[PDB]
Write a protein that binds this ligand. Structure first.
Ligand SMILES: Nc1ncnc2c1ncn2[C@@H]1O[C@H](COP(=O)(O)OP(=O)(O)OP(=O)(O)O)[C@@H](O)[C@H]1O
Ligand SMILES: Nc1ncnc2c1ncn2[C@@H]1O[C@H](COP(=O)(O)OP(=O)(O)OP(=O)(O)O)[C@@H](O)[C@H]1O
Ligand SMILES: CC(C)Cn1c(=O)n(C)c(=O)c2nc[nH]c21
Ligand SMILES: [Ca+2]
Ligand SMILES: [Zn+2]
Ligand SMILES: [Zn+2]
Lengths: 694, 146, 49, 48
């Protein structure tokens, strides 16, 4: 493996049909036989692993202990027909057959898998690189065909990206992807986050900041993977472990609890339909259930208590699952502002930024980067801004002890204190807790859940407050959420349309109060008139209440003007009220809703169509790639897959810096400096090597 | 075929065979497909409408029962909100069908201590239920055409 | 997928679909791994015949 | 009609140089080319 790494380093910066790559191919040709032997070793053991799992092999197994004899093993091999006689004899020799000739095929198969995996991966990488940089060489396809099984096995784990390197040329990078990382990426929540991020960046995202947004998405997703792994499942300490188990179960089953709470709300509100009011007990009214069984009231009580419990569990599940991301992002943006913008060092928040004022508190707190990984940002900010702004000033702002700083590096201090409840209390950081709790209370979802819970508690006081929990169907169902979003889209416009309607009705009310009071009697009895426009406020209320609700307007509700000196004035009045108010403004409301539907639809269509026509990374169109068959999807699955770009960052983080290649070090340094130039833009490996490739 | 056989038992079952004009005619099939396109959305809009009317019914059952008498004869009152189920049926049946909403069908609140509460009640019912949700249905159909 | 289990062992499986030899093709392709007798039992095939 | 007018104005300004009329694709052949073009090479504020 180390030798193969040396060869791969020799291939750093290699161009298509490069002399070093051709030299490698010639050397491999010289060493063909031994290369074939190595590839055959790997593929034979790879196939043995699957054969032993094959049930047809298990048919030959006739021993309760799970052992298989040498003859029966030979027959199984010849039945599967993949192996030759010499190969079967070699496998028999490698089998640790007892005196009874019995074999443990399980351990036999498992023996050489882990030892040979890294060398297998690096051989696959070498062959892939050589094939892609010397695309036309018959001597290489022989080796590739022989390596088929290795390549198929390592295909999900062979990550492939393209960067703009120091050579001012596009370079392909091959790396390893871990099964756990791939699984975590394929988890559905990451998929939803990915879809949301894509929609946002494609619809309201700037090209300049696209890569920064992508890297932020990758960071947040990594943090979410950590949280998911932590909550995943395989006397004070016993209490603690039970606590973490219970909290993690809540976090894992958060959504199920929300669905259950909605179900309980529906059950309670179904029951509440049976209430009835009577003067007598079953001058005060009495509300009581009306059922024959009598079992419903205790059921209502139990459902109410359980609903409140589930609301509490949902609060805790949210606090355990979702809040950490909020804090991580808030801490991260604060740190990047400090280091790269000098917010509280040079600029200072505008004082209209409540978040900027709130973030002052946590700067001097020891626990500032609790969830966000970078623990050294305070030091970085000091090194960057101290010469100008005052080292003591920076230390005072960030709660730093300059004397303690240097000694910590000089020599290790480990003042381990015994664990105690009092010691824990003293360790609490009240300022960080206050800042955090402000963030949480500002978070909208937490507020919604707290309101849900408060309404449940109020339902216990009066059970009819449990009806508000039925509004959660909007949050639960995507379809209703979209329908409501159509309304919300132009909500400000609708509100101002309502205000304009009120103004128009006020003008009509003024006219009626001046000239048309006689017509606004709603009393049939001549003795007691009920005049709705002798006062301007009453006239306005009358208009806005009855006329708007009427189909023909106020004229439908006020006394006919036939045979009156103002008949034509009033017909104009009524018809204009009808057209302007009833027809046009309402029509405006429907049109706003319809336009919202169309706007959401064309947003989704545009996102789909951009993703199908352009590479999210380079921005090149599908036409160039489709010049070659299947080019665009090959590009988006192999060359410029964004999942592979994230996999590369995870691999970089988990890899030691001494072992980084030149390419990995380049990209790692650019990540540290927050430079996104390595991401290819307007260029690709194919376009760069177009003439040579064709 | 089954409906034809049933028509032989009672000839009025032969009317269901007139629904085949949809399958026969392409134009009607397209018009119906416009509706079906957002059918799930329409169904959930109806469910949301039911929820809103249920909340309004709860409010009326708590505070506005007095106004829900539909009997002119003082001797025999017909109160449509002394029971929650009757109040819900009343709302969903008459108020939705009414142009101005339930306020069109229930007793005027003038000169009552809850007059302003009820005017808010009626106007909000009118805008949300009658105007917006129905508007959503038309908009769904129009978007399906487009 | 569950309903299609029934017709696998039936002689008349490819009645309307042209390829009458698919059972044989499946045997040749998957028998070495999955068991020839198993494939024949699943697809209503008599190996001797 | 008003909405697609605003959308069209936005989309023209994001896809073309107000001065030369060349598309964003040519410039984006080089990274960040279009915004470099519109901020440095063909900024209309600079023409004024
Ligand atoms: N650089 C890119 N990386 C990945 N996908 C890209 C890229 N550029 C464009 N795309 C488009 O993004 C889409 C992503 O494909 P993918 O199947 O993973 O997503 P999906 O449609 O959400 O399906 P899934 O259910 O598998 O998550 C593809 O249609 C591809 O055309
Ligand atoms: N020749 C050009 N000069 C300036 N802008 C151009 C030119 N051609 C196209 N544009 C587009 O015009 C827009 C002008 O950018 P600018 O940030 O000044 O405007 P804005 O979106 O109105 O914002 P601001 O709030 O800063 O005024 C940019 O999106 C740029 O893409
Ligand atoms: C998401 C985060 C916890 C993991 N993470 C990260 O995303 N970036 C970018 C780093 O540089 C880093 N260094 C350590 N952990 C890191
Ligand atoms: Ca090294
Ligand atoms: Zn690309
Ligand atoms: Zn220009």
């Amino acid at each position: 493996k180390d030798m193969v790494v040396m060869l791969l380093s020799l291939l750093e910066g290699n161009v298509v049909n490069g002399m070093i790559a051709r030299q490698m191919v010639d050397m491999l040709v010289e060493s063909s036989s031994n290369v074939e032997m190595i590839l055959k070793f790997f593929d034979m053991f790879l196939k043995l692993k699957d054969i032993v799992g094959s049930e047809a092999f298990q048919d030959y197994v006739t021993d309760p202990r799970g052992l298989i004899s040498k003859k029966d093993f030979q027959k199984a091999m010849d039945s599967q027909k993949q192996f030759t006689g010499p190969e079967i004899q070699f496998l028999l020799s490698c089998s640790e057959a007892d005196e009874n000739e019995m074999i443990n095929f399980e351990e036999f198969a498992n023996r050489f898998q882990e030892p040979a995996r890294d060398i297998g991966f690096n051989v696959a990488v070498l062959l892939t690189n050589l094939s892609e940089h010397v695309p036309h060489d018959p001597r290489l396809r022989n080796f590739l065909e022989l390596a088929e099984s290795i390549l198929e096995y390592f295909r999900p784990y062979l990550g492939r990206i393209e960067i703009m390197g120091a050579s001012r040329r596009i370079e392909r990078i091959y790396f390893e992807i871990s099964e756990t990382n791939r699984a975590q990426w394929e988890m559905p929540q990451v998929k939803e986050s990915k879809r949301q991020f894509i929609f946002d960046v494609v619809n309201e995202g700037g090209e300049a900041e696209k890569m920064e947004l992508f890297v932020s998405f990758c960071e947040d997703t990594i943090f979410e993977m950590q949280i998911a792994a932590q909550i995943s499942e395989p006397f004070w300490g016993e209490l603690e472990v039970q606590r973490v188990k219970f909290l993690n179960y809540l976090s894992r089953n958060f959504y199920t609890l929300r669905f259950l709470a909605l179900f309980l709300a529906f059950a309670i509100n179904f029951i509440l339909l049976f209430y009835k009011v009577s003067d007598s007990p079953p001058n005060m009214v009495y509300y009581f259930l009306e059922e024959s069984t009598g079992y419903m009231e205790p059921a209502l009580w139990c459902l109410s208590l359980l609903h409140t419990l589930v609301a509490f569990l949902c609060i805790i599940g949210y606090n355990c699952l979702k809040v950490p991301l909020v804090i991580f992002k808030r801490e991260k943006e604060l740190a990047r502002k400090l280091e790269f913008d000098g917010l509280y060092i040079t600029e200072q928040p505008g004082d209209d930024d409540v978040k900027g004022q709130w973030d002052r508190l946590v700067l001097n707190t020891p626990s500032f980067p609790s969830n966000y990984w970078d623990k050294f940002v305070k030091r970085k900010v000091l090194d960057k801004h101290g010469d100008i702004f005052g080292r003591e000033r920076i230390a005072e702002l960030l709660g730093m002890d300059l004397a303690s700083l240097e000694i910590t590096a000089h020599n290790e201090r480990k003042p381990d204190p015994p664990p105690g409840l009092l010691t824990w209390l003293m360790s609490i950081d009240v300022k960080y807790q206050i800042w955090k709790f402000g963030v949480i209370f500002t978070d909208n979802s937490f507020l919604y859940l707290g309101w849900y819970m408060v309404m449940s508690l109020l339902g216990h006081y009066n059970n009819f407050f449990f009806a508000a929990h039925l509004l959660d169907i909007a949050m639960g169902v995507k379809t209703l959420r979209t329908i409501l979003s159509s309304v919300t889209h132009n909500g400000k416009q609708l509100v101002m349309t309502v205000g304009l309607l009120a103004v128009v009705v006020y003008l009509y009310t003024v006219v009626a109060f001046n000239f048309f009071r006689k017509f606004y009697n709603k009393s049939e009895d001549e003795d007691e008139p009920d005049m709705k426009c002798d006062d301007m406020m009453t006239c306005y209320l009358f208009h806005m209440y009855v006329g708007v609700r009427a189909g023909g307007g106020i004229g439908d509700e006020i006394e006919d003007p036939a045979g009156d000196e103002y008949e034509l004035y009033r017909v104009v009045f009524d018809i204009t009220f009808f057209f302007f108010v009833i027809v046009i403004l309402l029509a405006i409301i429907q049109g706003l809703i319809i336009d919202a539907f169309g706007e959401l639809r064309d947003q989704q269509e545009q996102v789909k169509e951009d993703m199908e026509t352009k590479c999210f990374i380079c921005g090149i169109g599908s036409d160039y790639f489709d010049t070659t068959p299947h080019g665009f999807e090959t590009h988006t699955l192999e060359e410029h897959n964004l999942a592979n770009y994230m996999f590369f960052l995870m691999y970089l983080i988990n890899k030691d810096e001494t072992e980084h290649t030149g390419q990995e070090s380049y990209v790692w340094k650019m990540y540290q400096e927050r430079c996104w130039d390595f991401f290819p833009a307007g260029d690709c490996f194919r376009k760069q090597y177009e003439d040579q490739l064709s």
